[PDB]
């Protein structure tokens, strides 16, 4: 049986770049709660003992940007210089430019660009397994830190999973997990042997189906040694520096645009969310085992400049026919996408939830782009 | 004939995110010029009337960080608040943490991660045409501004090209350019009709091969109207926010790591450069018409955790044998990659050149990863 190795990674919610994504989206959520039509382009940067928020917001809302920053940092676990950032003591520089302020079908794209959606039948959430496992291991690290299962953990860390795959006529069939890597922040209370045991038994084994683990699977557990201080300390983070972790883990494709800190009318976000929904609908409707969808835009133009569907030779009908069905079923105009995906509703940290552990493959009803649409094809 | 549409974009050197890439790499170049063993992780951000450099540098060099910032901005054309940033008025916040400081094959990776390289026979530089045309239009906008051909241009702008492709048994065959988009910054001296004429005659016609243009090609030229102020004014830029423009324009794959501001020991950069060299060599040796290569690392480990080669069904020998030849020929260990691609050599703004209009498909001798390696194989 011929196989190949495909690797995906993840970073934890305390990684300094991911921290920035979460602060950016916390600012967006706070704006939408008061003013659902807010225009938000909120960028965040961090380094030793400092967080800066900047960019442009048009809103009727009154926002305590500093409190949102400190609350986000505190809840992630950055409560002391020892952990790598003190939410209550660090410098917070608020450099946002805030100003005060419509047939949806005529709303032009706010920018050019292109966006890709991907789906695969290899997991029930129609996501690539290398990505799902790296991501779920990260989420589990956060979970066992916060629920007291592994209280020695600290917020920062990274995960990486190599999967051995078989190509079944274009469909990706995982065979086994080849290598698992975790590098996690921790306190001084735990030995290296305790870290290794707890990561294997509390984190890895609950997440990776046992059918994919065997006696040859390679485990690298804090390979480079102890990791006590993390987050922004002696480091730096920025919004929009984890875009492959945010999407498909190297699978599919990416058009370049980041998601966090962007109001949902922005095509980098809404456009990518709708093409996930499209690709996921193609595969869920049994029209293909795998699907890649591209859309692109011009600034000021409502209708996309181009759309592409490719099913990696797995479509039951030719890709030209799937593209027709996708164009008939999905509305790619920006004023329409935000309404169809209910993206301005602005409930319980709706976008902050997206800003760690992936924008796709999550079954939370706020992730409206994960809802499959029926497709007509006989 | 069955076709499909694929789109790539580019942004100009005055785009605020690209400005940050160029400043980051200008800092790296300054560090390597004095101290080739500098460790550099220089991040840059910008907003109205402000640039901030930050991150960590280990170096013996003495660097005037403020001067590098203002010189980089001024050279791009940020010379007035009317253009959208004045290099000789703006705030420059130097927030870098700078400190003072052996068998190469034993050097572990400085981080985890994965990286992809790609090549395609559809252009002479073995790059995707959609990406090449978007990028070269951008580079041509900068050239005609700076050489005085179109003096009405300003530094910011964006380009986007949709290409109509045929699939030839996995190989990508461009048929025609479907749609060309340019949104460019300009001064108050030029009418909309002069902008449209000049972009068509000075910028598009010189760059896009005539064989790909026809009477149905769609042109969008400043479709949203006038664009006089740009760069960071009422906007924001960050290093590492144009990583698809830096690489393959949606084609191939990306592992997530940005390039600019990183010294070339960092696998996000050297790893990506070596797999471009590997993918390019597989296509240039005639082993395949198209190639994708992944490598991945673990912190502290010299040998890659995984490698894969996929030729999209275009390989003339099985992909498993191309993988074996690639692994026999290329050394993916981080201490080796930097020496083999001569990446610490640090002369005339070697990395700042990479930081606008793409890291790949350029024939400058400093782009050592574009040099094809001979591969040993038997054509069946
Ligand atoms: Mg980073
Ligand atoms: Mg790091
Ligand atoms: Mg954008
Ligand atoms: Mg940007
Ligand atoms: Mg001075
Ligand atoms: Mg912009
Ligand atoms: Mg990195």
UniProtKB/Swiss-Prot annotation, chain A:
GO molecular function, one term: ATP binding
Keyword Nucleotide-binding: yes
Enzyme class: transferase
Entries under InterPro entries matching the protein: ADOMET_SYNTHASE_CS, S-AdoMet_synt_C, S-AdoMet_synt_central, S-AdoMet_synt_N, S-AdoMet_synthetase, S-AdoMet_synthetase_sfam
Binding site for Mg(2+): 9
E.C. code: 2.5.1.6
Binding site for L-methionine: 56, 99, 235, 266
Positions of ATP binding: 15, 156-158, 224-227, 235, 241-242, 258, 262, 266
Regulation: Inhibited by 5,5'-dithiobis-2-nitrobenzoic acid (DTNB) and N-ethylmaleimide (NEM) (in vitro).
Keywords from the UniProt entry: ATP-binding, Cobalt, Cytoplasm, Magnesium, Metal-binding, Nucleotide-binding, One-carbon metabolism, Potassium, Transferase
Pathway membership: Amino-acid biosynthesis; S-adenosyl-L-methionine biosynthesis; S-adenosyl-L-methionine from L-methionine: step 1/1
Magnesium keyword on record: yes
GO BP, one annotated term: one-carbon metabolic process
Cofactor descriptive note: Binds 2 divalent ions per subunit. The metal ions interact primarily with the substrate. Can utilize magnesium, manganese or cobalt (in vitro).
UniProt catalytic activity: L-methionine + ATP + H2O = S-adenosyl-L-methionine + phosphate + diphosphate
Residue positions binding K(+): 43
Function: Catalyzes the formation of S-adenosylmethionine from methionine and ATP. The reaction comprises two steps that are both catalyzed by the same enzyme: formation of S-adenosylmethionine (AdoMet) and triphosphate, and subsequent hydrolysis of the triphosphate.
Family: Belongs to the AdoMet synthase family.
Subunit structure: Homotetramer. Interacts with GRF3.
PANTHER family in the cross-refs: S-ADENOSYLMETHIONINE SYNTHETASE
Name recorded for this polypeptide: S-adenosylmethionine synthase 2
Lineage, opening ranks: Eukaryota, Viridiplantae, Streptophyta, Embryophyta, Tracheophyta
